[PDB]
């Protein structure tokens, strides 16, 4: 229930691996953000110097937050579409971290992946509808913004508009066409809430990767797990701890720590390390190499 019991034998990656291969760990939820795709060539938002927030000066914005805000987008969509052209990759190649989540699916351990990313790499790695909540939407599809129309357009169509530097307009009504992403100020998809309600009743392990846990309501998902569910963060930096003034936050280090583990480094490296403990290293290496070779062959 709301009882804090310690289920990990030690607060380390090795403890987590032993837990995962015990009978008690049947249902894993992954919570992921932009840090899992930086090694695929899509910058994150908040890393100093390389993050998007430090690379927006040329967009002539009234302030740097505006390019990801819906009110600004509706008044002036051109900066967002100019940024999209700058960031759009010529190749969509998921990372080792993405393929680790594919292994969790194939091994029958993945209850759900909640992602904040819009880059479609989870789908390319093989996560399907049953497996995936795109909490901040996706570029995979786009829609006309007019309420009476809402025509859908595929990514091939949206890509061509972005690269032509033509602001995308609906062929049926000539309204703006917007990628199916959730800007600041927009509602998250309904399936975010339906999945959260159900999934967090029965999760045995929470695996948090590549996110600063600064955007809501996504960040609050860590607090929805039962109090005895272990939580592993694989990230370059600690994240998710309660602020000492504003304060179910992460507790890696206090005298009361009992279930949260931080593995600090590259998401690809941490996933590889965890796979090795699990006996999955060869499977992961073979999977990534074959999928990458097939993508390179396209």
């Amino acid at each position: 229930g709301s009882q804090k019991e310690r289920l990990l034998d030690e607060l380390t990656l090795e403890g987590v691996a032993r837990y995962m291969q015990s009978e008690r760990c049947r249902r894993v939820i992954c919570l992921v953000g932009a840090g899992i795709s930086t090694s695929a060539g899509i910058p994150d938002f908040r890393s100093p110097s390389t993050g998007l927030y430090d690379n927006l000066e040329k967009y002539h914005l009234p302030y740097p937050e505006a390019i990801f805000e819906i009110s600004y987008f509706k008044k002036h969509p051109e900066p967002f579409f100019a940024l999209a052209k700058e960031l759009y990759p010529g190749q969509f190649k998921p990372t080792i971290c993405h393929y680790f989540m594919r292994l969790l699916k194939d091994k029958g351990l993945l209850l759900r992946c909640y992602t904040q990313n819009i880059d479609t790499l989870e789908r390319i790695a093989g996560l399907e509808q049953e497996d995936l909540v795109e909490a901040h939407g996706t570029f995979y599809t786009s829609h006309c913004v007019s309420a009476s129309c809402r025509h859908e357009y595929p990514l091939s169509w949206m890509k061509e508009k972005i690269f032509s530097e033509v602001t995308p307009k609906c062929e049926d009504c000539q309204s703006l066409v917007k990628p199916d992403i959730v800007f600041f100020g927009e509602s998250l998809p309904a399936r975010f809430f339906s999945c959260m309600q159900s999934d967090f009743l029965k999760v045995d392990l929470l695996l948090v990767m590549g996110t600063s846990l600064q955007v809501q309501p996504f960040a609050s998902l860590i607090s929805k797990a039962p109090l005895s569910t272990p939580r592993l963060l694989i990230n370059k930096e600690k994240a998710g701890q309660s602020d000492p003034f504003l304060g179910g936050g992460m507790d890696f280090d206090s005298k009361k720590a009992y279930r949260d583990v931080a593995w600090l480094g590259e998401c690809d490296q941490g996933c590889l390390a965890l796979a090795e403990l699990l006996g999955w290293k060869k499977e992961l290496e073979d999977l990534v190499r074959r999928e990458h070779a097939s993508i390179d062959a396209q």
């Binding site: 959730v182 600041f184 100020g185 998250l188």
Partner: peptide
């Protein structure tokens, strides 16, 4: 609910 910082 809405996406917020």
């Amino acid at each position: 609910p809405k996406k917020t910082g």
